[PDB]
């Protein structure tokens, strides 16, 4: 319950791999993450939804753990509906 929103930041390796794990999500699944960051990080909700600007060094620790937790749920499966 509180481990997600009151989490500590992940390392540079993990943040970078998180950029890579969202890159793995097919457009359908991907649209969630683009939305997640934009929803949690108001400062980048000005980014065009087609070309969203994510700054992994500014995202909240909970944002990272929402992004990672969500994508890993997808990667750890046969994620080939639109890919």
């Amino acid at each position: 319950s509180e481990e997600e929103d009151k989490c500590k930041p992940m390392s540079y390796e993990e943040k970078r791999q998180l950029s890579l794990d969202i890159n793995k999500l097919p457009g359908e699944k991907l649209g969630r993450v683009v939305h997640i960051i934009q929803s949690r990080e108001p400062s980048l909700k000005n980014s065009n939804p087609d070309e969203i600007e994510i700054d992994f060094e500014t995202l909240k620790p909970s944002t990272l753990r929402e992004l990672e937790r969500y994508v890993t749920s997808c990667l750890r499966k046969k994620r080939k509906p639109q890919a």
């Binding site: 457009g27 700054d55 060094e57």
Partner: peptide
């Protein structure tokens, strides 16, 4: 210095 330009949701 890490930026993720996720390019998607483009209208078709």
């Amino acid at each position: 210095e890490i930026k993720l330009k996720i390019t998607k949701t483009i209208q078709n």
